[PDB]
Amino acid sequence: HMESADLRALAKHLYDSYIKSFPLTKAKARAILTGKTTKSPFVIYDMNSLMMGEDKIKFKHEVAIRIFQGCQFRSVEAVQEITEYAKSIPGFVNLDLNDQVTLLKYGVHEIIYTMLASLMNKDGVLISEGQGFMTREFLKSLRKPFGDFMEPKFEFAVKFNALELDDSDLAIFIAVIILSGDRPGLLNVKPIEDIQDNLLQALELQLKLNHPESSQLFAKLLQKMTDLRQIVTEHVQLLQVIKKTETDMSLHPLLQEIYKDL
Amino acid sequence: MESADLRALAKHLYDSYIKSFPLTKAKARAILTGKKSPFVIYDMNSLMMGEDKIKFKHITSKEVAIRIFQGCQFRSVEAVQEITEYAKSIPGFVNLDLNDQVTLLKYGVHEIIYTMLASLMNKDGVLISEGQGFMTREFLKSLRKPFGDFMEPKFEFAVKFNALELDDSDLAIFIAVIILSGDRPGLLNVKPIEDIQDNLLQALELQLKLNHPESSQLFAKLLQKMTDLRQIVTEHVQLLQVIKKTETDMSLHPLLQEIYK
Ligand SMILES: O=C(O)c1ccc(-c2nn(C(=O)c3c(Cl)cccc3C(F)(F)F)c3ccccc23)c(OCc2ccccc2)c1
Ligand SMILES: O=C(O)c1ccc(-c2nn(C(=O)c3c(Cl)cccc3C(F)(F)F)c3ccccc23)c(OCc2ccccc2)c1
């Protein structure tokens, strides 16, 4: 339902808007993680280095709570960037306004975990626009339920990163996630699915041109949407334990609204 | 992988799918749409008459809601054996590590049962006993305590899944894809499983293009349903646990408890 040139044009549009919307790309994150440059992050691996990192790293946003609350504020910034990106997806702002809210409500976390994988390897995650690197072992060692928060994200990212996607692939994949016609409470499924159909055609052609030797990469990427859904559900149940255990811990109102009745 | 090889693989699976499963989607749709009218169970009195006249096996505690629930469990155990026989016809499956064969079936059967159950359902009810009976959605949803809300999610899934309008030749490949899932926990040799799934996916993609040329990106939409299947199977497990801990009248002969574990 779309010619090849139109699908290439749509792929280029989305990549361009992705570069404009997300300040830390996978390409930059990989150049920081693979090193070979003098761009080097400060590495936080224990309590003493955290204390030194806060002195050296210029953070834009008890140790476990401090790290948790900071993650929440980074997630809110991520929602803002994802929302800016979503408005560039052709057709999205023309949808019913309640459906725009619904698509963002259920899509933003799946996108956050997708894009978080770009900042991750098996040993830890880049933080503060790549200025810092916090080890997976240090996060797993946090007290109470906080230790178990990041480990599922690392588990996903190790598998997702084996697909070797780049930002130009990811730009379309993220659009596909937002324009999901199966979100609960949608009023007008038909125009959402028509946009997703074009996005899926564009993703399929993008993966064939950019990864010609990666057989059925399109199918394998769509199957990862299953892993994303699973970790979002785990995440929601994990916060509920914190809400009942940590009663003095505030959650950001934007995050409060997203998780409500999910 | 050439097109003729993919078509050969698609036809092999369709042929085996027909032999392994007692009621095809095509035959089920002919019964459901009214095109030997099945005996209809729509309340307690018709249930009792169905057990007396048709004598439905698996629906033979004296409480009705429990009896119907256990009957779903008993049919699902029968379905597992049909799925196991079908799996053996998938090229490459029996050549896998024997523990990996068991693991793929153990973790795949719930998703496959839900998928194939949809072939037997419409928005008003479900066929039972090889299409000889039809039990209404309202009767199942009206069962007491948690049993009623146990049945309704199955219908909600099936109504959405059936909107894709797959036929048996599509489903035969799709079921094979689910079985050859390389991400099941405890697999020892993932590589040959993903190599077989890659062939099956190529065969499903081509099958869907030739069989539904007007249904844009149906391949993508069907793979997106694997998300729904995983989600409802996880929900299913939690619902069973609540029933296991709450209900005291669910006891069977210990030998039957072992069979239908
Ligand atoms: O201030 C800052 O610039 C800043 C910046 C980042 C973090 C921080 N983010 N984060 C994430 O997962 C993450 C990331 Cl990388 C990128 C995008 C979206 C997300 C999230 F949406 F998924 F959230 C973490 C996971 C584990 C630990 C930290 C992060 C951050 O953490 C708070 C913190 C860090 C160190 C010391 C004290 C507090 C702070
Ligand atoms: O023919 C067939 O392929 C087939 C296949 C499935 C059912 C049937 N299973 N089922 C379940 O809950 C279920 C499911 Cl989805 C997946 C795994 C395990 C279970 C269960 F173990 F938990 F059971 C149902 C819930 C409601 C309605 C039907 C099912 C099935 O039901 C026939 C039936 C219906 C009512 C009374 C007696 C039999 C038939």
UniProtKB/Swiss-Prot annotation, chain A:
Q: How is it regulated at the activity level?
A: PDPK1 activates its transcriptional activity independently of its kinase activity.
Annotated keywords: Activator, Biological rhythms, Cytoplasm, Diabetes mellitus, Disease variant, DNA-binding, Glycoprotein, Isopeptide bond, Metal-binding, Nucleus, Obesity, Phosphoprotein, Receptor, Transcription, Transcription regulation, Ubl conjugation, Zinc, Zinc-finger
User: Which coarse location class applies to the principal site listed for this UniProt protein?
Assistant: nucleus
- Keyword Phosphoprotein annotated: yes
**Subcellular location field:** Nucleus; Cytoplasm
Cite the location of the cross-link Glycyl lysine isopeptide (Lys-Gly) (interchain with G-Cter in ubiquitin) from the record: K20
Variant or mutagenesis effect after changing R74H: In colon cancer; sporadic; somatic mutation; partial loss of ligand-binding
Where does the chain bind rosiglitazone?
Q72, F73, R74, S75, H109, H235, Y259
Keyword Membrane: yes or no? no
What is known about its induction? (Microbial infection) Expression increases when incubated with M.tuberculosis or its lipoprotein LpqH; induction is TLR2-dependent (at protein level).
Q: Which GO terms describe its cellular component?
A: chromatin; cytosol; intracellular membrane-bounded organelle; nucleoplasm; nucleus; receptor complex; RNA polymerase II transcription regulator complex
Instruction: Spell out the family assignment given in the record's similarity comment.
Output: Belongs to the nuclear hormone receptor family. NR1 subfamily.
**Record: disease:** Defects in PPARG can lead to type 2 insulin-resistant diabetes and hyptertension. PPARG mutations may be associated with colon cancer. Obesity: A condition characterized by an increase of body weight beyond the limitation of skeletal and physical requirements, as the result of excessive accumulation of body fat.
Q: What is this protein called?
A: Peroxisome proliferator-activated receptor gamma
Taxonomic classification, please? Eukaryota, Metazoa, Chordata, Craniata, Vertebrata
Gene that codes for this? PPARG
Q: Which residues of the full protein are shown?
A: 235 to 504 of 505
